[model samples]
Target: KCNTATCATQRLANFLVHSSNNFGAILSSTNVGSNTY
Candidate 1:
């Protein structure tokens, strides 16, 4: 009942969200380190 386009879009969206979270974590860690210093 599913098509390639729909599946691809969903997977891409999930990847983007996951990547954004990782990027945010890195930025947050960097900021914390600077604050500590």
Candidate 2:
């Protein structure tokens, strides 16, 4: 199972990185396949 705090921390990190990106590449990458959201 995934660690709760670790997961939340990564989520926050992802949001920060994606929010700072001008091109939204990471946002698009997350929706590529089975992990689509």
RMSD, every candidate, angstroms:
11.3, 15.8
| Alpha-carbon lDDT, every model | 0.45, 0.49
Model 1 TM-score, 2 decimals: 0.10
Off by over 4 Å in 2: 1-19, 27-37
Model 1: runs farther than 4 Å from truth? 7-37
lDDT of 2: 0.49
Error of 2 at 17 (Å): 11
Which lDDT tens digits does candidate 2 get at residues 1-37? 7757656434344343434636655434343447534
Task: Tell me the TM-score of each prediction against the true structure.
Answer: 0.10, 0.12
Q: Give the TM-score of candidate 2.
A: 0.12
